[PDB]
Amino acid sequence: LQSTLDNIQSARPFDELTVDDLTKIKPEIDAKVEEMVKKGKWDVPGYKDRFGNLNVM
């Protein structure tokens, strides 16, 4: 816990981390994302529950 927090209090690059590098940090992210769009469904249960979809403006 102490080391993870030390890797948290200044080691969460929430702005300039590569997007696909999340699949590098999360080994199943790549597989599931390929799996998620692969079968045909392009939606996930609340993929944006805390985010907005927005119109053109």
């Binding site: 993870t4 927090l5 948290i8 209090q9 929430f14 805390r50 907005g52 403006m57």
Partner: protein, 52 residues
């Protein structure tokens, strides 16, 4: 001429867009930027609290 009136009107339309659509698109981009920023910051500081 055949390709003149539209050429002169292109800058007029662009200025018309800059009058409203430029700041409008700026506001739309900034609002979503701050919304996603808060959405990621809350998740981060909540995972920090979960580790705590």
């Amino acid at each position: 001429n055949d390709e003149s009136i539209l050429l002169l009107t292109f800058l007029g339309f662009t200025g018309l867009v800059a009058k409203y659509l430029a700041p409008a698109y700026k506001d739309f981009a900034d609002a979503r930027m701050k919304k996603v920023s808060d959405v990621l910051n809350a998740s981060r500081n909540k995972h920090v609290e979960a580790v705590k």
